[PDB]
Each structure stands twice: as C-alpha cells, then as structure tokens.
C-alpha cells in the first residue's frame, strides 16, 4: 500500500520532486486529500500508481474545491478515462457548476473529452497552421520569436491534446523551419528501433565498427542540434530507373523505419549520372512511393550537393587522401603518389573541361576490405545534366556521393543492400564530417522475374510484353496494374522479415497476401468468358446481390430479373461423369430444350424451375467487358538468368503469354468502376480494372486465383 508510506515518500512516488513534496507536506489539507486520493486510486487499480496518474491525482487534490466529488473524479483518473491535463481541467470546471450530486455520466464524459483521441497528424496540422500564420516573423526573429503563440494557437484548436505533444511538435517544426539555433508482428512494430536493436539518434558511436575520432562527439553534438534527435533516413533511386518488388522492401524499410520511430525520410534521387529526362519513370517512382502509403519529408537530388561534394573532394586531395589518375580501367596506379599540388591542378583542370571522358579521374587513396585499390571519386562526363545542365563536366561516383550526402542530410540510419561499410566510415572520417551509421539488409528477389531496365526495355522492344507496366512483369508499377493492392505488397514485406540476405522467393507467397486483402476488400460480381444464351420457358416477368458474402454488414447491390439470362459454356454438359452440375440467387433453371449447331456447337438452351444441385453464376441483361488472362512470363518458374544455363533469358520467353477474351459478358455491378478497382468474379477469381477502361469500353485484368494446390 502506498497508503502506508510517510507523506514525503508517498508524494515523491506519485511523481512530485523532492522539493515539491516537502512543500506539499506542509499543506495539511492537501496532504490528507492527496493521500486519500492515492489510497482510493491504488484500491481500484490493484497496482502501484505510475507517475502520470500520480501527477493528475496531485492536480485533483490541489484544486478540487468540492471534496464531495473526490471519489468520483479519482475513479476516472484511475481508470485512465481522465488521463490528460485539460480533461482534469474540464472535469473540475464541470464539478464546480454541478452541485447536483447525482451527476449525469454521459453529460460529464462528453463535456470532459473522456473518449476523445487526438492523433499526431492533428497536432502536426494545428502546429503547421500556426507556423504558416507567423512564418515571416518566425524567419526574422528566429529563436527570439515568442514560441508561446504557436502553442497557444495550437492549444486553441486541440482542446484535449496533451500539452507536451504540442510542445514537442512545435519545437520540431520550428527546428525544421529555422534550422539550428547556432548560439508475425505488425510492420510498424517490427520497425521499432528497439525491436531491431538500432542505435538511438546521436549514439552512432555504439554501433559496430564505428570509429570514434577526436571530433566524433562534437560532431554528434552538432548533429543533434540540427536534427533535434530525430530519426532520419533516405531512399535513393535513380530518377530514370524502374522500381520492382525488391524496392518495396527498400521503401518500407527506409520510410517505414522513419515512420515507426517519429522520424523523417528523404527521397533523394540518385542523379549523379547526367542523362536525358524520362518523365514517365520519375513520376512513377514518386507515385509508387505514395502508392505504398508513404510521403517523403523532402525531395532532394544528389545534384543539389555537387558544390559541397566537390569542395570535399578538394579537401581529400589536400589531406593526401585523393589524387588525379590517368589509368583507363587491378594494376597499381603510377599516379597515386603524385605531388598534391599536381592533383589540385589537374582536378581543377578536370572541372574546366580540359580532359576527354576517361582521360582523367579522381581516386580515393586507400585499399579497401576486399583488396580493391583506390576507388574512383570523380569522372569526366559531357552529357548535359537534366538539372545542372552544362554547369559540370565532372561528377562524383555513387559510393562517394551517397555516403557524403548521408552526412550532409544528417541521416541517422543509412539503410542499404549488400557492403563496404568500412569504406563508408573511411570517407566521413577522412574529412572529419558527421558519420551516419550504415546498416545493410539482404536483397529481396522473386523467381520467374526479370527486372533490369535494359532487359525490360527489350521485353517491350520484342513485343513479348505490352509495356513496362505489363502485369506479367514484377515491376512495382506492373503489380499495381495487375491489380495488387498496396496493403498486400506491404503485408508481404512485413511477413518476409526484417533482416536477411539475398533471398530469391516464389511469387505465390506474395499472391497469397494479394488474396487475403482482396477477400476483405474486393466486392463480388459475376461474369464468364465462354458465354451461352439461356432462354426461360417459364418465369414471372431485381434480385438484390450482396457486396460481401461472409459479412453482409457491407451492403447489397441490385441486379436484373429478366428471363433471357446468360451462363458459362464450361458448366453446360450433356454426357455424364463422376463430378459435375447443371442459379446463385433466384431459381434452379432445369434444362427443358437443347439446341445444336451445324456440327456440335450447342448454341442455346431452355430452362424452367425454382425452389439442391450445385448453384452457379449468371448474367441477366449483361454489360460487355474485355478481360485479359495472363500466364507466367518466363517458363522457368525459377530464375531466367542462367543458373539453369538456358544460354538465353530471351529463349525462356514462355509462348503462352496473354489470353485476351475480347468483350465477354459481366454483371451490371461492374458499371461505375474506375481503374484499379478490384472485384471478385464469383467463380473465376479476383480481377481489377485496367487503366484502359472507360465506362464505355470496360477492361479487366486477371489479378489472382482463389487457390493454389
């Protein structure tokens, strides 16, 4: 019992400081009441009272004028229904002004925000709103500005928000605006920093192989002033690249780790190589990121940092850690010990366009872990750059670049695919700049898939595939067109795991997750390709169909009652066998008459029954829709690249390819359907609206089967 502690001990246990407790204790009425509150609280908590509940009980004890209601308010604080300062403040406002003493639980609870949840996004938006409101004055006054106004205006929008959450959001958004004061389990639980055993921001020095220089601690101090201790990550695709399923592990890891840890993630385009824009790919990268449910804190480009990358390269030369080389490209470079001043001179000369591509290079001066000598920092390239045009004719290499851009953007967790971490550190430490922690995870790849841009652009060149978005490809944009829901791909990445190696996997494991999302999300409607006309010799002359079968709590849509209904030519048989059959809603429709064409083309049917056979699917007054059915792109379900050594991955082009249906018949439930909307075609499988589908000429894609075995 906390009820048996001396008041000094009790009060420090409730979370008062020693100083506040020794004061409180002089106040007899407050001590007796605070003690009373705590006794009742521990009673109906069956527990020791945590600090947060304690501070509130303190507030209650110190402010409740009307002792009569103490057991009332304590019960709420205990059961955590009142767990916020403005909740307690509102309950106290309510207790004054309600002496009635049978108090209406519902009135009180609503008046005190009892159930109300305030989300981070909400606080984020209230704070952002206040900042915009004051931005000009914020930018000039900088840290002299009254931060009170921001919390003020934020408070006034969020009555029931925790004040510290507001304060923290204001602090952080002000930091991002001002810069430094220079004076299996859930995907998101899986990416908790504590779950993965990743370092806390600013504690890079605890990670393996990290080097603590004489500047490191100061460097991390500066790091924390710039970042405010926030987790920062990056995703760095080429702006002209094509994303595939492996990139989904990357996107979820970098944006997800940021998201799971109150952090930010940079979309940093790797545009170190000057090349013409291909706007379709760029926007597709941006879209795919958004599509899987993430938003870049900021969009940057490696080319933004060309000036600083160059400056740092000059500084490497000055420190004897880089030199200008004339090897063409391993053979020891004749130039690696040339005088520093020759390297300063020729590096400038490289920049001034005095060398042809390949005639000169800048190299770091080290031996790497794998025995590689002197990796290249800079090459001469004269293709105009899409963003800096002809401003540069020298460009940093990939590893040099994104390592030092990580330092520039103060990345806390640089997450990559395998692993030259030793050389990453070498670079930052050679220049004594902030050194982010690099962590390598294992690639993710799928069998029967080819994802090289050069190879994809030639699957499209050779018409084996309709476009780079074609559902037989395993690119991200393709899987979306094929009809996969983002949730599925993410759920897939969640289930595969967090820390592995090159793990080439079988596609059906993913399609598994596609099914499990379309089941709870894709509404059902009926259709078939091989259609037959069926004639009713019988019926009465709007049979409502549910949206989701296993839970009707979703609603229903009306479909036709007319007698001319159509069915599947795969259900209509004459002869007998072991297993077969032959309606879903109306009757049973027994075969009265049977036609036959010139040969054995059964051309129509007559039917007349109502109501125990086997129920099938049909379409009365049908809408005419195109349907595309797809096969496995590569014959070898396993990899096309030559482990099999087929001698050609273009030989493995499996001749089945596409099965186009050319406007068969479908329920009028798929009428107001927009592209990427997904349905269950009630006996065939899951299908989604291809982006070629107007309301006029509707088109569908065969997303996934209902089962495997």
Q: What is the DSSP track for 97-162?
A: T-TTSS--HHHHHHHTTSS----HHHHHHHHHHHHHHHHHHHHHHGGGS-THHHHHHHHTT-TTS-
Pairing state of beta strands 531-533 and 566-568?
Answer: antiparallel
In CATH terms, the fold of domain 120-177 is Arc Repressor Mutant, subunit A (1.10.10)
Question: In the numeric block, which tokens belong to residue 237?
Answer: 């695709």
Question: In the numeric block, which tokens belong to residue 593?
Answer: 């008459």
CA distances 364 to 244, 333, 336, 345, Å, are 33, 12, 9, 16
Pairing state of beta strands 394-396 and 376-380?
Answer: antiparallel
Catalytic site residue 637? Answer: no
Q: Which of 142, 443, 495, 683 is catalytic?
A: 443
Other Cβ atoms within 10 Å of 191 Cβ, number: 22
**Spatial CB neighbours of 17, under 8 Å, sequence gap ≥ 6:** none
CB 398 within 8 A of CB 270: yes
3 state DSSP class of 244: strand
What crossing angle do the helices spanning 51-63 and 85-95 adopt, rounded to 10°? 30
From 275, 228, 700, select the one nearest 471 (Cα to Cα).
700
Question: In the numeric block, which tokens belong to residue 697?
Answer: 């000429």
Mind giving me the DSSP string for 674-704? PTT-EEEETTTEEEEE-TT--SSS-EEEEEE
| Solving technique | X-ray
From 511, 512, 493, select the one nearest 503 (Cα to Cα).
493
Q: Is 508 marked within a binding site? A: no
Separation of alpha carbons 41 and 340, rounded Å: 74
**Spatial CB neighbours of 81, under 8 Å, sequence gap ≥ 6:** 109, 114, 115
Question: In the numeric block, which tokens belong to residue 436?
Answer: 């982010």
Separation of alpha carbons 166 and 122, rounded Å: 10
Q: Is 247 marked within a binding site? A: yes
The distance in angstroms from the start CA to the end CA of the chain is 61
CB 603 within 8 A of CB 595: yes
CA distances 596 to 536, 574, 591, Å, are 17, 11, 14
Q: Is 398 marked within a binding site? A: yes
Catalytic site residue 379? Answer: no
CB 232 within 8 A of CB 202: no
Q: Is 285 marked within a binding site? A: no
**C-alpha 674: how far from its chain's center?**
24
Pairing state of beta strands 678-681 and 664-666?
Answer: unpaired
CB 231 within 8 A of CB 264: yes
From 547, 492, 465, 509, select the one nearest 704 (Cα to Cα).
509
CB 511 within 8 A of CB 537: no
Q: Is 246 marked within a binding site? A: yes
Separation of alpha carbons 145 and 165, rounded Å: 20
In a 13 Å sphere around the CA of 31, the CA atoms on its Cβ side amount to 16
Q: Is the dihedral of CA 55, 58, 62, 68 positive or negative?
A: positive
Q: Is 444 marked within a binding site? A: yes
HEC states along 309-349?
HHHHHHHHHHCCCEEEECCCCCCCCCCCCCCHHHHHHHHHH
Which residues share a beta bridge with 441?
417
Phi, psi of 451 (to 5 degrees): -130, 0
Q: Is 238 marked within a binding site? A: yes
Catalytic site residue 69? Answer: no
Q: Which of 453, 455, 495, 683 is catalytic?
A: 453
Asked if the 9-112 domain carries CATH number 3.90.950.10, the reply is no
Separation of alpha carbons 627 and 649, rounded Å: 28
Q: Is 453 marked within a binding site? A: yes
Q: Is the dihedral of CA 655, 661, 667, 670 positive or negative?
A: positive
Question: In the numeric block, which tokens belong to residue 67?
Answer: 């002792």
Pairing state of beta strands 535-536 and 503-505?
Answer: unpaired
Q: Which of 169, 232, 234, 238 is catalytic?
A: 238
Other Cβ atoms within 10 Å of 388 Cβ, number: 16
């Amino acid at each position: 019992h906390m009820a048996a502690l001396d008041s000094l001990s009790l009060f420090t246990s409730l979370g008062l400081s020693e100083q506040k407790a020794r004061e409180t204790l002089k106040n007899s009425a407050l001590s007796a009441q605070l003690r009373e509150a705590a006794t009742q609280a521990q009673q109906t908590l069956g527990s020791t009272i945590d600090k947060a509940t304690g501070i509130l009980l303190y507030g209650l004890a110190s402010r409740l004028r009307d002792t009569r209601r103490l057991s009332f308010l304590v019960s709420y604080i205990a059961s955590k229904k009142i767990h916020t300062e403005p909740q307690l403040s509102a309950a106290l406002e309510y207790v004054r002004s309600h002496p009635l003493d049978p108090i209406d639980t519902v009135d009180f609870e609503r008046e005190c925000g009892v159930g109300v949840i305030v989300t981070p996004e909400q606080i984020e938006e209230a704070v952002e709103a206040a900042i915009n409101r004051h931005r000009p004055q914020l930018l000039v006054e900088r840290y002299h500005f009254n931060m009170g106004l921001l919390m003020g205006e934020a408070r006034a929008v969020l009555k029931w928000a925790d004040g510290k959450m507001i304060k923290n959001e204001v602090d952080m958004q002000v930091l991002h605006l001002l810069g430094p004061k220079l004076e299996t389990l859930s995907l998101m639980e899986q990416l908790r920093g504590e779950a993965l055993k990743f370092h806390k921001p600013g504690e890079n020095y605890k990670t393996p192989g990290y080097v603590v220089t004489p500047h490191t601690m100061n460097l991390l101090k500066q790091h924390l002033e710039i970042t405010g201790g926030q987790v920062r990550t990056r995703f760095p695709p080429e702006p002209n690249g094509i994303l595939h399923i492996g990139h989904a592990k990357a996107i979820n890891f970098n944006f997800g780790y940021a998201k799971a840890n109150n952090g930010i993630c940079f979309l940093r385009f790797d545009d170190t190589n000057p090349e013409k824009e291909e706007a379709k790919f760029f926007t597709a990268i941006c879209d795919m990121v958004a599509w899987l449910g993430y938003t870049p804190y900021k969009v940057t480009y490696a080319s933004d940092y060309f000036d600083q990358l160059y400056a740092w390269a000059v500084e490497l030369i000055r420190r004897g850690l880089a030199y200008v080389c004339h090897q063409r490209g391993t053979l020891p470079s004749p130039w690696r010990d040339r005088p520093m001043e020759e390297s300063l001179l020729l590096f400038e000369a490289m920049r001034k366009g005095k060398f042809s591509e390949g005639e000169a290079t800048l190299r770091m001066k080290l031996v790497m872990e794998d025995g590689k000598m002197d990796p290249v920092a800079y090459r001469v390239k004269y293709t105009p750059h899409h963003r800096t045009g002809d401003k540069w004719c020298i460009y940093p290499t990939y590893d040099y670049t994104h390592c030092l851009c990580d330092s520039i953007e103060h990345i806390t967790h640089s997450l990559c695919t395998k692993a030259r971490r030793s050389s990453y550190f070498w670079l930052c430490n050679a220049l004594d700049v902030y050194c982010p922690v690099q962590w390598e995870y294992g690639r993710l790849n799928l069998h029967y898939a080819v994802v090289s841009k050069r190879k994809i652009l030639q699957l499209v060149a050779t018409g084996a595939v309709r476009d780079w978005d074609d559902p037989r490809l395993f690119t991200l944009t393709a899987l979306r067109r094929r009809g996969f829901p983002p949730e599925a791909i993410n759920n897939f990445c969640a289930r595969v795991g967090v820390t592995v190696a090159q793990t080439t996997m079988e596609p059906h494991l993913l399609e598994a997750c596609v099914r499990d999302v379309l089941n709870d999300t894709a509404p059902r409607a009926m259709a078939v390709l091989e259609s037959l006309r069926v004639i009713i010799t019988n019926f009465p002359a709007d049979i409502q169909v549910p949206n989701f079968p296993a839970d009707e709590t979703k609603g229903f849509h009306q479909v036709p009652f007319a007698p001319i209904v159509f069915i599947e030519r795969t259900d209509f048989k004459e002869e007998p066998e072991p297993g077969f059959k032959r309606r879903h809603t109306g009757y049973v429709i027994e075969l009265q008459h049977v036609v036959k064409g010139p040969s054995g083309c059964v051309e129509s049917l007559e039917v007349t029954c109502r109501r125990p056979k086997a129920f099938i699917h049909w379409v009365s007054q049908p809408l005419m829709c195109e349907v595309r059915l797809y096969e496995r792109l590569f014959q070898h379900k396993n990899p096309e690249d030559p482990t099999e050594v087929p001698g050609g991955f273009l030989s493995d082009l499996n001749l089945a390819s596409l099965h186009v249906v050319d406007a068969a018949l479908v329920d009028c439930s798929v009428a107001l359907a927009k592209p990427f909307d997904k349905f269950q075609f009630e006996r065939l499988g899951y299908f989604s609206v291809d982006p070629d589908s107007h309301q006029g000429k509707l088109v569908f894609n065969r997303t996934v089967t209902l089962k495997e075995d």
